[PDB]
A paper describes a structure:
Here, we expand the repertoire of known macromolecular biotin binders by reporting a novel biotin-binding protein A (BBP-A) from chicken. In the present study, we show that the chicken BBP-A gene encodes a functional homotetrameric protein. The BBP-A structures consist of four identical subunits, each subunit adopting a β-barrel fold of eight anti-parallel β-strands with an α-helix positioned between the β7- and β8-strands. The BTN/BSO-binding site is located at the open end of each β-barrel.
The crystal structures of bBBP-A in complex with BTN and BSO were solved at 2.1 Å and 1.75 Å resolution, respectively. The biotin-binding site of the BBP-A – BTN structure mimics the biotin-binding site of AVD. The side-chain oxygen of Glu102 of BBP-A is hydrogen bonded to one of the valeric oxygen atoms of BTN, whereas in AVD the equivalent residue, Ser101, can not form a hydrogen bond to the valeric oxygen because the distance between the two atoms is too long (5.8 Å). The methyl carbon of Ala74 of BBP-A, on the other hand, is positioned only 3.7 Å away from the valeric O10B atom of BTN (numbering according to), but is not likely to be hydrogen bonded with BTN unlike the side-chain oxygen atom of the corresponding Ser73 in AVD, which is hydrogen bonded to BTN. One clear difference can, however, be detected: the hydrogen bond present in the BBP-A – BTN complex structure between Glu102 and BTN is missing in the BBP-A – BSO structure due to the different conformation of Glu102 in the two structures. The binding mode of BTN to BBP-A is also highly similar to that observed in the known structures of AVD, AVR2 and AVR4.
Numbering used by the authors:
A (entry chain A), B (entry chain A), C (entry chain A), D (entry chain A): 1 to 56, 59 to 125
Write the structure that this text describes.
């Protein structure tokens, strides 16, 4: 069963697109992310990601990745697990932190936004 | 100036140790993490990490990484920026999400812990 | 228009129920919360909440509240904004932190879970 | 022992000041917050807060509150526990979410910043 294999094109509720290329045997993967949204006034560009998954009880292993935004000084990390429901539908449940670059140490308090995303496989 | 180079051994306020190996030119890095603490009842083991930094205005670039815990079903992601103060002292300001593996989709609501860490370079 | 008035019975995607009683003129409100889920092994009980909303540009004001769980040592805080869509449907977008009570200061790192909820008005 | 009574003037690492007035018997409290920092370009003003603490094993009970900022469209909620160390020193360990008001539902993804604070009692 290839169900819940991270490898693939995924989309989230914001309309973002994400590709995860094949995992190596260490469980590390790379890919790219096309966000539909930005907190900057910059043109959105496809951006590389780098992550790792835990080794596979009936449960998909947890994974995480870092997106290196190509058009913004920021960095997002996403952490999640895949689930398959009744009718075979796969979903990535993810929580994320978006870190903006700040000029001095004293601005770090405001540098991190948090939220969640739900991804499903693009048909 | 090698000030705020991620490469190195770092420690945080919890007494965790972290090594970041040299960055490649794409800005991706790997390394390992020795946490002083765990939310499981398992023996702590050194664990690989995989991350990426943004390219370097006077400001260090943001970075993120994923720790693949070797003794736990979980995954942590850390996101941060380095700062150098007056007397040349470097600090990584980081926020993180720890994701526990859960049996079903309905338990995802409780799967993510959040917090911050401050790292300084081991002498 | 009473659209997006916090006053009311709301439900979230987890199937939790929440009542917010009338706001006073200072914008503070109280109410109760019936969670469908718990991270403890205790019987769920209806729990008081205490919050405040900002004063009302076309935008609903932000609000927050604290739930004092009656069956758990923990405390949740929720922060959010209400939205009304095209066909008049109201939704509370909320982010939350659940704080478990810990025995010593050194366990605080693991004490806080984070997530989001979406509430709609019970018909 | 009045050790770890929330009632009092507290300060955090950012240099913010906070007053918590006496708790009522239900455990609800009010007070005010003077932040040293803001993410807006507005003049900072003292702001009311409204919270509740859990009832008091050797462990302080968890609490939470909402700050209704008087100079910003936002709302912060803080959740925490008090600790007393060896030499009698009290500390509030807190995690928080700052929610900015957004024009439409589609901007909610970026509306929530997260972080932590440590408060000690003003001498
Ligand atoms: O605005 C930035 O600085 C970079 C774009 C970040 C987009 C964020 S990452 C989390 C959330 N989920 C998405 O699919 N996009 C937004
Ligand atoms: O408990 C687990 O499931 C894995 C160990 C996680 C340790 C966390 S990661 C964030 C925080 N910072 C640390 O240095 N260690 C803890
Ligand atoms: O488990 C506990 O310690 C108390 C119950 C907490 C339920 C949480 S609060 C956030 C999330 N949203 C809900 O409607 N319920 C869970
Ligand atoms: O900027 C705003 O919109 C309101 C001021 C918020 C200040 C935040 S709240 C969390 C953090 N801790 C503080 O003591 N101040 C900042």
């Amino acid at each position: 069963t290839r169900k819940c294999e991270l490898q693939g094109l995924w989309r989230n509720e914001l309309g973002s697109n994400m590709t995860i290329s094949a995992l190596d045997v260490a469980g590390t993967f790379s890919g790219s992310y096309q966000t539909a949204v930005t907190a900057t006034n910059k043109q959105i560009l496809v951006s590389p990601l780098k992550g790792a998954q835990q080794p596979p009880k009936g449960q998909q292993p947890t994974f995480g990745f870092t997106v290196q935004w190509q058009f913004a000084d920021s960095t997002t990390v996403f952490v999640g697990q895949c689930f398959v429901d009744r009718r075979g539908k796969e979903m990535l449940e993810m929580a994320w932190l978006l870190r903006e670059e700040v000029p001095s140490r004293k601005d770090t308090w405001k540098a991190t936004r948090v939220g969640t995303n739900v991804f499903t496989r693009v048909k």
